[PDB]
Design an enzyme around this catalytic site. Structure first.
Site, mmCIF file in Angstrom:
data_model
loop_
_atom_site.group_PDB
_atom_site.id
_atom_site.type_symbol
_atom_site.label_atom_id
_atom_site.label_comp_id
_atom_site.label_asym_id
_atom_site.label_seq_id
_atom_site.Cartn_x
_atom_site.Cartn_y
_atom_site.Cartn_z
ATOM 1 N N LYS B 10 0.882 -1.152 0.000
ATOM 2 C CA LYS B 10 0.000 0.000 0.000
ATOM 3 C C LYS B 10 0.928 1.212 0.000
ATOM 4 C CE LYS B 10 -2.155 2.310 3.900
ATOM 5 N NZ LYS B 10 -1.289 3.457 3.529
ATOM 6 N N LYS B 15 7.273 2.144 1.716
ATOM 7 C CA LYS B 15 7.666 0.948 0.982
ATOM 8 C C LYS B 15 8.869 1.126 0.089
ATOM 9 C CE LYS B 15 5.186 -0.333 -2.577
ATOM 10 N NZ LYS B 15 5.985 -0.499 -3.800
ATOM 11 N N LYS B 41 3.670 7.743 -9.887
ATOM 12 C CA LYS B 41 4.473 8.855 -9.342
ATOM 13 C C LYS B 41 5.957 8.703 -9.649
ATOM 14 C CE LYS B 41 6.575 10.315 -4.932
ATOM 15 N NZ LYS B 41 6.923 9.871 -3.543
ATOM 16 N N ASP B 129 -2.368 -0.475 -3.624
ATOM 17 C CA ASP B 129 -3.596 0.194 -3.226
ATOM 18 C C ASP B 129 -4.736 -0.361 -4.077
ATOM 19 O OD1 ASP B 129 -2.700 2.396 -1.284
ATOM 20 O OD2 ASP B 129 -1.312 2.645 -2.958
#
Ligand code: SF4
Lengths: 286, 289
Positions: B10, B15, B41, B129
């Site tokens: 997530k 992470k 991103k 996610d």
């Protein structure tokens, strides 16, 4: 007549709670509303229904073979203030588009005439961690014209708003889907309201309401209820009432101006969130 | 025997910093590694390059306009320790599947056989996610065999770990995808490690390591770097070396047994994270009871 709206935003910032609290205030206000949850997880209606977990169109569709057998009274349940509720559900993890359940739900509610049986507002509670496929469907297919984005003074929540705003621009000429405003779900951060007012103004929209954090929220949630039903006399109940009123009277429905990452980082630095980039310190830490 | 792995998790819990510090430690171990960031991103490689942001395939596939056309100089930048860092990027919000950046990047890399060019480990850094056909790709197409899940003692992080496990399940037969373990990035929550150990046990895997909170991470992050290159003599630096060696020597690759929402909420309740519901007061207003 009926206004089709959608609350978009990243996960984990209290969005579904804000949606159901806003919808309850609308219903308390005399409005006839339907919520169509679109999160695969299905947690957009429990506070209205005081329920464990509402059965999703997808779970059911997988039972009586297909979505043709499904009954409407089995899919749509009504709760507080008469608010109707349905959960789209989603496919099994990793199999196809995670947000496709919406297409199944919308198409079914359509055939069943759900949208003409006494409705003033329809609110699709949609996730915006990614804006593609089933997630962008309510926008693409012109199913919701008034989009309100829930966000907070955090990088990712802001990034999602920007990409959702991007999605609205892309379908501009496609229909009448427009951005009605940003709703700030406070995370008890300093100058948070200012930060979002700053981004909304940069987007070409408005921060339609700043939702403060308040324990009464969890006290209401632990009982599977909204603050409007749990404690109407609470200060927080008025906040959701204010939001409801502004949404009802909203006239500002625009085509957003997506900022850039640098602008994003600018607002965050500027407001006490991100730190200004030192330079001698980079590349060769020590 | 180049090993193809993937770190799923997530977003919003460090992470990528873990993936990067993990790979850095591996690099220091004299291992040849490549990171394929599969995050829109694109922050799966900055710490390795000391960059603000690396150019993605998608972005430069919109310069030359044709999927294939980027020798690995403008696309595959090697940085610290010889770790080759690549970024997939994603398409524009609403323009096809967001996993197009991933599905692209690989084929392109298999076309330059970047996988065969002196490599011991490849780590795809993917967000969990949303677990859909788009992002489960590396798993589905058998691109990643060893999966490691980064999570924290929180609802969504554990929910994301269970969903990644479901996706591993689904393909455990068609190929060799297996779950190597859980990596808990501590967010300073009590009993977080014991909660993840518990989850590891239930899922039928292991919590391969507990990554602690050490401000030297945020410190080295500012420097646009890993804790390993920053101050290899940091106490935290040793936590990555430990995780790294367990990854290198991991025999335990299993097919996860996902749990139900009850089991999860059950877990969360016994560790003091989720409140136990009082059945009697459900649906009663504050004035009534
Ligand atoms: S369009 Fe988005 S949600 Fe759908 S499968 Fe592709 S990456 Fe996933």
């Amino acid at each position: 007549a009926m206004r089709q709206c959608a609350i978009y935003g990243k996960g984990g910032i209290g969005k579904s709670t804000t949606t159901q609290n806003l919808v309850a205030a609308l219903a308390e206000m005399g409005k006839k509303v339907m919520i169509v949850g679109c999160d695969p997880k299905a947690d957009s209606t429990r506070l209205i229904l005081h329920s464990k977990a509402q059965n999703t169109i997808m779970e059911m569709a997988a039972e009586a073979g297909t979505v043709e057998d499904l009954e409407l009274e089995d899919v749509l349940k009504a709760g507080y203030g008469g608010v109707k509720c349905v959960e789209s559900g989603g496919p099994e993890p990793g199999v196809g588009c995670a947000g496709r359940g919406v297409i199944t739900a919308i198409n079914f509610l359509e055939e069943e005439g759900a949208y003409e049986d006494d409705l003033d507002f329809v609110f699709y509670d949609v996730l915006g961690d990614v804006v593609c496929g089933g997630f962008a469907m309510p926008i693409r297919e012109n199913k919701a014209q008034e989009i309100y984005i829930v966000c907070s003074g955090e990088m990712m929540a802001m990034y999602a708003a920007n990409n959702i705003s991007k999605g609205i621009v892309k379908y501009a000429n496609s229909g009448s889907v427009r951005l009605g405003g940003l709703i700030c779900n406070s995370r008890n951060t300093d100058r948070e309201d200012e930060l979002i007012i700053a981004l909304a103004n940069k987007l070409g929209t408005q921060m339609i309401h700043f939702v403060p954090r308040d324990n009464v929220v969890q006290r209401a949630e632990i009982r599977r209820m909204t603050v409007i039903e749990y404690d109407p006399k609470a200060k927080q109940a008025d906040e959701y009432r204010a939001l409801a009123r502004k949404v009802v009277d909203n006239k500002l429905l625009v085509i957003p101006n997506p900022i850039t990452m640098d602008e994003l980082e600018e607002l965050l630095m500027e407001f006490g969130i991100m730190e200004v980039e030192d330079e001698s310190i980079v590349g060769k830490t020590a």
